[PDB]
Amino acid sequence: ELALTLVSLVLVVSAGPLVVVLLSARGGNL
Amino acid sequence: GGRDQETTGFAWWSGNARLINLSGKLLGAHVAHAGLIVFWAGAMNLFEVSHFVPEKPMYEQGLILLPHIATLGYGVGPGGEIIDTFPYFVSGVLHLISSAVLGFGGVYHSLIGPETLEESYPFFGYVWKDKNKMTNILGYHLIMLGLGAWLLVWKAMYFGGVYDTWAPGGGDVRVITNPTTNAAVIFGYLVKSPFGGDGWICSVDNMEDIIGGHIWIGTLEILGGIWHIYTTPWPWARRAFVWSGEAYLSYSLGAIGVMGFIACCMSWFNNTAYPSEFYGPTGPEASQSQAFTFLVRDQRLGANVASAQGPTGLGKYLMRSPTGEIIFGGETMRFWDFRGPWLEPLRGPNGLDLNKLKNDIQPWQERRAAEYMTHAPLGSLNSVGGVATEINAVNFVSPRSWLACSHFCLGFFFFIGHLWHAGRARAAAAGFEKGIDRFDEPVLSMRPLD
Amino acid sequence: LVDERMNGDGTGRPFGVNDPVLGWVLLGVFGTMWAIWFIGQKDLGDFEDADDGL
Amino acid sequence: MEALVYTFLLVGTLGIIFFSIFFRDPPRMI
Amino acid sequence: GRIPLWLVGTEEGTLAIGAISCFFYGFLCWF
Amino acid sequence: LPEAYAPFAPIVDVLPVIPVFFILLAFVWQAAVSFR
Amino acid sequence: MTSILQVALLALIFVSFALVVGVPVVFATPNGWTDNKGAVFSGLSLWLLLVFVVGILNSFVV
Amino acid sequence: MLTLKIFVYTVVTFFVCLFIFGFLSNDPARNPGK
Amino acid sequence: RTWFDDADDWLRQDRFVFVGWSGLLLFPCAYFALGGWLTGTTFVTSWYTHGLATSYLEGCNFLTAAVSTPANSMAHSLLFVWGPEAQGDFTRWCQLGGLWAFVALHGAFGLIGFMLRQFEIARSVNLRPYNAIAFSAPIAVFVSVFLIYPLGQSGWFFAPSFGVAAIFRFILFFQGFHNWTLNPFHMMGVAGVLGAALLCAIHGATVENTLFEDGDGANTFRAFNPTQAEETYSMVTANRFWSQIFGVAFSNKRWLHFFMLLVPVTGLWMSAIGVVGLALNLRAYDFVSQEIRAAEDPEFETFYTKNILLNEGIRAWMAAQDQPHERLVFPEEVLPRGNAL
Amino acid sequence: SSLWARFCEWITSTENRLYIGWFGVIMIPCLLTATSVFIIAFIAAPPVDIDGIREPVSGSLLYGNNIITGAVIPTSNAIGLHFYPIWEAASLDEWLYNGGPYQLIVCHFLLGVYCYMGREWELSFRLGMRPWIAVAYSAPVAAASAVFLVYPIGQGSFSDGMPLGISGTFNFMIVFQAEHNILMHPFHMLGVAGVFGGSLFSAMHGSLVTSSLIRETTENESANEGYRFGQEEETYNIVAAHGYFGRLIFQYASFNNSRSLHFFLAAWPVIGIWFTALGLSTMAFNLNGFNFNQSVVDSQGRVLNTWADIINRANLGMEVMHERNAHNFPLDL
Ligand code: CLA
Ligand code: CLA
Ligand SMILES: CCCCCCCCCCCCCCCC(=O)OC[C@H](CO[C@@H]1O[C@H](CS(=O)(=O)O)[C@@H](O)[C@H](O)[C@H]1O)OC(=O)CCCCCCCCCCCCCCC
Ligand SMILES: CCCCCCCCCCCCCCCC(=O)OC[C@H](COP(=O)(O)OC[C@@H](O)CO)OC(=O)CCCCCCCCCCCCCCC
Ligand SMILES: CCCCCCCCCCCCCCCC(=O)OC[C@H](COP(=O)(O)OC[C@@H](O)CO)OC(=O)CCCCCCCCCCCCCCC
Ligand SMILES: CC1=C(/C=C/C(C)=C/C=C/C(C)=C/C=C/C=C(C)/C=C/C=C(C)/C=C/C2=C(C)CCCC2(C)C)C(C)(C)CCC1
Ligand SMILES: CC1=C(/C=C/C(C)=C/C=C/C(C)=C/C=C/C=C(C)/C=C/C=C(C)/C=C/C2=C(C)CCCC2(C)C)C(C)(C)CCC1
Ligand SMILES: CC1=C(/C=C/C(C)=C/C=C/C(C)=C/C=C/C=C(C)/C=C/C=C(C)/C=C/C2=C(C)CCCC2(C)C)C(C)(C)CCC1
Ligand SMILES: CC1=C(/C=C/C(C)=C/C=C/C(C)=C/C=C/C=C(C)/C=C/C=C(C)/C=C/C2=C(C)CCCC2(C)C)C(C)(C)CCC1
Ligand SMILES: [Cl-]
Ligand SMILES: [Cl-]
Ligand SMILES: [Fe+2]
């Protein structure tokens, strides 16, 4: 069913750039 | 410093080229890339396992990776049936797990691990000039590829067996007992003409010949590895080559482009290593199946199969070859070179035996001929089967078309990449990769031409 | 037959060779060109480690 | 009749190509 | 400071990819 | 799916699109320094 | 036994979420290998234990 | 036709051998250099 | 001082955009062509004139949407909103295909306003007006295919509709009715277009390839002062290069860029003349000699006499649904069958 | 000194006028072979059975064909993909009947243009330039090899290659539209954008440079004598040209760098042609174009018609007439 796959895909996608968000916030060498 | 523009001289869109003198980060890049390859190989496999239906033929579902395991012969029976899904599931999950290990190693070398392994590791360190060390690494790669070939040889010879498509009574998994390793036969295919009738190594027919050639490659690559670990290049090759970083990429790009073209022409024409029960019928096979189906149709009504003169004098059903054989008619006179297992028992010394076409037609042959003209490879980009002048009836594109077109494009781009790098590497070794110097100019010393 | 022809299509022979007379020409050109090159090796650059690359 | 006219025109085009390649003015310096 | 332009462009790219994915989904079986 | 792994059929159908996002991740990672 | 698979599988997926989130952050922080090291060791060990436990339990699932 | 075929193989293999033993004959040093 | 002085102060004040004395034409008379094309592709059907449902509201895609031409019974009227065919009833005016006659005849002045704006900035910044005379050629093309072709040929219905899948219908319309292929003016046109596409790639892959040495790193884009009195590419070296490979090679980069100017406009004007000659139905259809020879001798069969016998198969099949105002329904025996292909 | 050293020095000299190099020893004789066969076969070739259905086809000037209708006929379909040289034939009145010079000329011309691309690398390396002319020349090589080699491999016959003639080219194109629907294919639209953008960018750059020529001559003589050859002065005010373009359209679509402008000119039409070169190779393997038959459907279930449903009628009209005497079984073209 699409209603679970969309939320799972949003989680898998938002796992990506939040790494860059946390590293740009906390002081990483991005 | 390291990840800089104005010191390294490379822009952000040429960022990988900042790794030419960085062995550890280069290693991490490669191991992360291998992690990506294994992760795709797991993910698409488990996707096709989740969407797989066993009652339906495998080429009617748009699957490309499951036939590569079914050709080796895990979970299949006679006639190309599918009895199981758990071997496919194991082959998915093992790649999906091993990709995590390779991704961890790649990220560790590309983030924390040391940049230059040549300081504290005199084994793994390498300079692009060091010819003996380059031949060492090439020897290790060749030994690993030789063991990779012997894995296939052992799977054919001892472990279960391989799905042959030339066993009688339909295709069947059998165990190779006598791999034909005749040198005068196996080194025929490497030399045969790449045109029609003859064919290049795409004209391979025997699983005995396939496994014997892999026995040859398994011996040869191990011998080459033992050669290059202990030898250095000789001066006729030490002056013929450009010895640098990017040049080594330049040779491999042209090689892998040739690999892609050979894979394309394999996957479009062959029916031995890519069996018709798993990937579908081929180009000539569709036309041969159509002509055979309409001949078996029109034979059982009263019209003759021999004296049925067509529109222009030539035979409507049976006619001759250019080289005297007896073949089908219509437009498969361009496709008379076809040899399939549903047709070869009906084929005698002069070709199509008229007595066998009267008396010896098999029901499984009738079924294969009835389904191949239905599922002939006539695709579309929006996945509508048939010709362009066909209504939206059947959602069908053959997997052979996707494999052929995709690998032809992906080989042609590697060819263009070779034309890039083989120029740029020799220009950088010469010393004018950045432009003509304004003071020392090579043209204003030369003569005019008038 | 009616006429005369080589009948070399569809055979599958190495290098398209039919006669050994046809086969000797390959080596008879290749070896002489190699010999001229190997004589011309005198006026080239041969070396221990003087390699032409980065 | 007209085949000779066709052949004459093609050969004349090729001749002007030949003279343009080999009998040009020399592109001379400063 | 402000919300940076790269973080603006990432969200604009995601809001473009979502609309294009809905365009393919309405392309497949919708009219 | 063959067996009791059946309720993971949603998250199986997200897997092959994941390797493509590494290119976009590299572009966003190099936009994070404003391309410098 | 099905739930014994599925709880371990959800734990494996969530440990993998923890890896994909934290381990690049721990690696890219300039003292993260000094600070969060035993946590990464225990996470990798737990990941391997979950993989082997699921692999052993799939034999007992009949 | 065989008289033609020997001649065609002769010309083809002469030019191909000239090609190969040209590129073995110290190519990347016949540049303007440094 | 007076009037026509503060109105020259403004309209020539500088901002981000540049409106001018012909920008006062260009910006109002265009942008409604864009709005009308988008409106006709999105909202507006073509069910009544042609018989084709070609809107976004009716399930069509970006490829298959087109602001459609009026019916043949609207012979050559200008099709105003008000007037003798629509009387200001805006819904009926949109149904009768007046949007195409809005957008085409309204953007025909948009091209004039754009070329005059291009002509006015070249007087403001004191430069030579060679950028103006090049844009006359797509104006000639636009006039020739959208304006002069429907006038002398009994209808605005016989005009290429503003779309993507309708331009394709127009191309097959010429290929199956006019045989636009055999027109020497079209040979001039394809020579101009494809030679310009050649020479662009040649010049681009030559100039930055025989480039000088100014920077330090291999990124050669970072080594260009825009305020420079030197060169950036070795003309002598590229001349010697293309002289030794190709034979003739240029030596005058005045003449080079002037030749790049001169090729595609020559191609497009020499295509526009042929489109005029096709508008008058002076088509490059069949010859005399091979036809009178092929009627006598049966086995002749050139590609020419196959293209004619193929174009007949185009024109007998597509017409009965292309143009319903003819009111013709061919029986299947009348169609060119080919004996069961 | 030695014979081989003197021969190599002559063949890699840069003072002979038309350069040769080491790819030139395959570029020169093979293309001279192809030219010397093509000029003969365009003039005096006997009629050729293109179809294998015992119907010869006239293609040469002597048999009632002018310059437009003259063509080298491709090889018959019964000959197939078989390599068919002169020496495998019976006579030269039998080699010319079954499509000989097409088989000879194409296999020559392809090797000729590949070695010509190698030569364009080699002379750049011999002079000391940067080597990327051959990368740009890879696009029309791909466009030639797709219609002469890849598509007949895909169709299994050398018949369906492009006939070497003006009036034969269009009979290739129209039947290709019939069987494969090339217009409804996204690679081909990228190539149309490539050629139209290439013409636009050539006319635009040749306008904006010629519109800024620094005056060096008078108004009576030629405006091309203002450039003395081999100078060091920039003859066009690129600052003023960029300012005019920025006033004309945009200041953020600048391309102020001359080198960025030249990269854009080098990469627009080449990447435009590469996608059509892939599109022909994909349609060779029967990976057909788009298909929008019977898409627009009313609420009942009846079939409405669109421009795709008119192009379907035109392609039916082409398809039921191409190869009029061969096809009997109802499909597979
Ligand atoms: C798959 C392809 C690939 C790979 C392997 C690399 C790899 C690399 N690039 Mg690179 N690059 C790529 C594509 C790729 N790039 C593309 C497409 C571009 C064009 C946009 C660039 C442009 C580019 C530039 C401009 C530069 C590099 C540099 C580098 C190197 C250092 C990166 C760094 O600083 O890490 C640090 C990374 C971070 C701080 C960000 C965190 C990223 C995390 C680790 C992502 C991991 C996610 C994953 C789920 C983790 C799995 C863990 C596992 C246990 C489950 C590194 C080896 C640099 C270099 O030369 O180094 C000196 C450099 O200057 N690249
Ligand atoms: C497979 C082997 C391979 C390897 C290892 C390399 C490695 C390298 N190449 Mg290279 N190259 C290859 C193949 C390869 N190339 C091929 C096949 C081509 C022909 C197209 C090229 C063309 C090429 C050029 C023209 C150049 C290089 C350059 C480089 C260097 C830096 C690259 C970099 O940081 O770019 C960073 C990567 C990017 C910016 C990626 C951009 C993405 C591309 C343009 C399109 C991606 C299409 C994608 C499939 C679309 C997916 C769908 C989409 C909707 C998401 C590096 C040594 C550059 C250099 O400086 O060399 C010294 C350079 O100028 N290469
Ligand atoms: C039976 C079959 C009949 C076949 C007939 C073949 C006809 C075609 C032959 C070509 C005749 C035209 C070229 C000859 C003039 C020439 O040599 O240039 C004059 C210069 C002068 O060289 C100089 O020549 C000197 C020699 S000489 O004294 O001048 O003779 C030398 O000493 C000096 O080093 C050098 O600088 O020669 C060279 O630059 C290189 C010589 C080779 C180049 C010519 C071949 C290239 C032709 C292109 C082929 C593709 C065309 C495709 C078809 C359209
Ligand atoms: C079906 C099977 C198909 C098999 C295909 C085989 C393809 C063979 C390809 C060979 C590539 C060789 C690469 C160049 C090799 C090379 O680099 O040459 C150079 C090398 C010597 O180099 P050096 O100059 O360093 O020699 C040392 C001293 O000269 C140093 O001053 O010579 C050889 O080793 C030749 C090796 C055997 C080559 C074959 C024998 C040649 C003579 C045979 C001809 C007989 C003549 C008969 C007259 C009628
Ligand atoms: C190595 C073998 C490969 C190359 C062999 C083929 C070479 C082709 C030579 C082209 C000759 C054309 C001479 C143009 C006349 C000429 O000599 O131009 C000379 C001109 C010289 O420029 P200049 O700088 O000297 O001019 C200075 C100013 O005062 C005036 O321009 O060069 C060019 O502009 C190049 C344009 C070539 C355009 C070629 C297009 C021709 C297409 C083919 C036409 C014939 C059709 C053939 C069908 C039968
Ligand atoms: C195994 C597994 C895991 C993991 C996975 C992964 C590995 C993920 C990652 C993913 C990713 C990796 C994601 C990413 C994303 C990103 C994106 C989606 C982006 C967006 C943006 C855009 C698209 C835009 C861009 C741009 C810029 C801003 C710059 C320039 C260029 C451009 C404009 C393009 C988990 C357990 C979790 C689940 C299950 C499976
Ligand atoms: C550094 C660098 C880079 C690259 C990166 C990479 C490429 C990495 C690798 C990555 C990867 C590629 C990784 C992998 C991972 C994997 C994993 C982590 C896995 C997990 C597992 C799973 C998820 C499974 C689950 C399950 C089972 C157990 C079976 C059945 C099915 C299921 C699902 C249930 C980038 C671009 C950022 C840029 C910058 C630099
Ligand atoms: C299993 C298989 C088999 C077999 C396989 C094999 C055994 C393979 C091998 C193959 C081979 C054994 C190949 C070869 C390769 C090599 C090559 C292809 C070479 C090339 C050339 C080069 C690389 C060079 C270049 C250049 C010149 C020209 C000279 C000097 C140097 C240079 C670089 C400059 C058979 C039949 C059973 C079939 C089935 C599959
Ligand atoms: C009708 C009419 C009129 C007019 C009105 C107007 C003024 C209108 C306008 C309108 C408009 C104003 C329109 C517009 C349209 C457009 C659109 C709607 C857009 C779309 C787009 C899209 C959807 C996107 C695409 C793309 C890009 C480019 C980016 C990236 C992504 C893509 C590629 C997708 C009047 C009353 C006067 C008169 C009468 C008639
Ligand atoms: Cl025809
Ligand atoms: Cl048929
Ligand atoms: Fe330019």
Short mmCIF file of C-alpha atoms and ligand atoms in Angstrom, two decimals, chain A residues 19-20 23 28-30, chain B residues 2-4 11-19 22 25-26 28-30 32-33 36 100 103-104 107 110-111 115, chain F residues 22-23 25-27 29-30 35, chain G residues 16 19-20 23-24 27-28 44, ligand 1:
data_model
loop_
_atom_site.label_atom_id
_atom_site.label_comp_id
_atom_site.label_asym_id
_atom_site.label_seq_id
_atom_site.Cartn_x
_atom_site.Cartn_y
_atom_site.Cartn_z
CA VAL A 19 23.83 14.20 8.01
CA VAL A 20 25.02 17.33 6.21
CA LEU A 23 27.74 18.30 10.38
CA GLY A 28 32.25 19.50 10.74
CA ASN A 29 34.63 19.75 7.79
CA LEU A 30 32.03 19.33 5.06
CA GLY B 2 43.88 18.84 0.49
CA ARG B 3 40.25 19.57 -0.40
CA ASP B 4 41.03 23.01 -1.82
CA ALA B 11 37.42 22.85 -9.68
CA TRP B 12 34.53 21.31 -7.77
CA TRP B 13 33.25 19.50 -10.87
CA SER B 14 36.69 17.90 -11.34
CA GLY B 15 36.96 16.83 -7.74
CA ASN B 16 37.91 13.18 -8.14
CA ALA B 17 41.11 14.30 -9.92
CA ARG B 18 42.34 15.63 -6.57
CA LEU B 19 42.90 11.97 -5.59
CA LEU B 22 46.26 10.13 -2.45
CA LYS B 25 41.46 8.15 -0.12
CA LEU B 26 41.63 6.57 -3.58
CA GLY B 28 38.33 4.35 0.05
CA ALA B 29 36.70 5.69 -3.10
CA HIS B 30 37.10 2.33 -4.82
CA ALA B 32 32.81 2.56 -1.47
CA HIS B 33 32.17 2.11 -5.20
CA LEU B 36 27.52 0.53 -4.33
CA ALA B 100 27.50 -2.88 4.34
CA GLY B 103 30.67 0.59 2.51
CA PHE B 104 32.14 0.74 6.01
CA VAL B 107 33.97 5.39 4.36
CA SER B 110 37.86 8.05 2.73
CA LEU B 111 37.33 9.95 6.01
CA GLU B 115 46.09 9.72 2.81
CA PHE F 22 24.52 9.26 -3.71
CA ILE F 23 25.07 11.57 -6.70
CA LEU F 25 24.19 13.62 -1.85
CA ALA F 26 27.56 14.56 -3.34
CA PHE F 27 26.03 17.60 -5.06
CA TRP F 29 27.61 18.07 0.11
CA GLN F 30 29.54 20.28 -2.28
CA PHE F 35 31.03 25.20 -4.11
CA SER G 16 21.29 0.20 10.62
CA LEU G 19 24.77 3.47 11.88
CA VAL G 20 23.78 5.49 8.79
CA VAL G 23 28.71 6.88 12.03
CA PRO G 24 29.31 9.50 9.28
CA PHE G 27 33.73 10.08 11.49
CA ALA G 28 33.44 13.62 10.14
CA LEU G 44 29.22 -2.91 14.91
C1 CLA K 1 30.59 7.60 -5.64
C2 CLA K 1 31.44 8.54 -6.06
C3 CLA K 1 32.33 9.32 -5.25
C4 CLA K 1 33.22 8.97 -4.27
C5 CLA K 1 33.56 7.67 -3.71
C6 CLA K 1 33.87 10.22 -3.81
C7 CLA K 1 34.84 10.25 -2.80
C8 CLA K 1 35.57 11.35 -2.44
N1 CLA K 1 35.53 12.61 -2.95
MG1 CLA K 1 34.14 13.13 -4.42
N2 CLA K 1 32.78 13.76 -5.86
C9 CLA K 1 31.86 12.95 -6.47
C10 CLA K 1 31.70 11.55 -6.26
C11 CLA K 1 32.42 10.80 -5.40
N3 CLA K 1 33.38 11.27 -4.48
C12 CLA K 1 31.06 13.72 -7.40
C13 CLA K 1 29.98 13.17 -8.21
C14 CLA K 1 31.53 15.02 -7.34
C15 CLA K 1 31.03 16.17 -8.10
C16 CLA K 1 29.98 16.96 -7.36
C17 CLA K 1 32.60 15.04 -6.36
C18 CLA K 1 33.34 16.18 -6.00
C19 CLA K 1 34.37 16.19 -5.08
C20 CLA K 1 35.21 17.32 -4.66
C21 CLA K 1 35.08 18.69 -5.15
C22 CLA K 1 36.13 16.82 -3.78
C23 CLA K 1 35.82 15.39 -3.62
C24 CLA K 1 36.63 14.75 -2.63
C25 CLA K 1 36.48 13.42 -2.31
C26 CLA K 1 37.27 12.60 -1.28
C27 CLA K 1 37.16 13.08 0.16
C28 CLA K 1 35.72 13.25 0.58
C29 CLA K 1 35.64 13.90 1.92
O1 CLA K 1 36.09 14.99 2.29
O2 CLA K 1 34.97 13.13 2.83
C30 CLA K 1 34.40 13.83 3.96
C31 CLA K 1 32.92 13.76 3.80
C32 CLA K 1 32.06 14.44 4.57
C33 CLA K 1 32.51 15.34 5.66
C34 CLA K 1 30.60 14.32 4.35
C35 CLA K 1 30.01 13.09 5.01
C36 CLA K 1 29.65 12.06 3.97
C37 CLA K 1 29.25 10.74 4.61
C38 CLA K 1 30.50 9.98 5.01
C39 CLA K 1 28.35 9.95 3.67
C40 CLA K 1 28.25 8.47 3.99
C41 CLA K 1 26.83 7.97 3.85
C42 CLA K 1 26.73 6.46 4.00
C43 CLA K 1 25.27 6.06 4.16
C44 CLA K 1 27.55 5.91 5.16
C45 CLA K 1 27.51 4.39 5.19
C46 CLA K 1 28.18 3.85 6.43
C47 CLA K 1 28.04 2.34 6.56
C48 CLA K 1 28.72 1.85 7.82
C49 CLA K 1 26.58 1.94 6.58
C50 CLA K 1 36.57 11.23 -1.30
C51 CLA K 1 37.52 10.09 -1.48
C52 CLA K 1 37.54 15.84 -2.11
C53 CLA K 1 38.98 15.45 -2.13
O3 CLA K 1 39.72 15.37 -3.11
O4 CLA K 1 39.50 15.15 -0.91
C54 CLA K 1 40.69 15.84 -0.51
C55 CLA K 1 37.25 17.12 -2.93
O5 CLA K 1 37.91 18.15 -2.85
N4 CLA K 1 34.82 15.02 -4.42
#
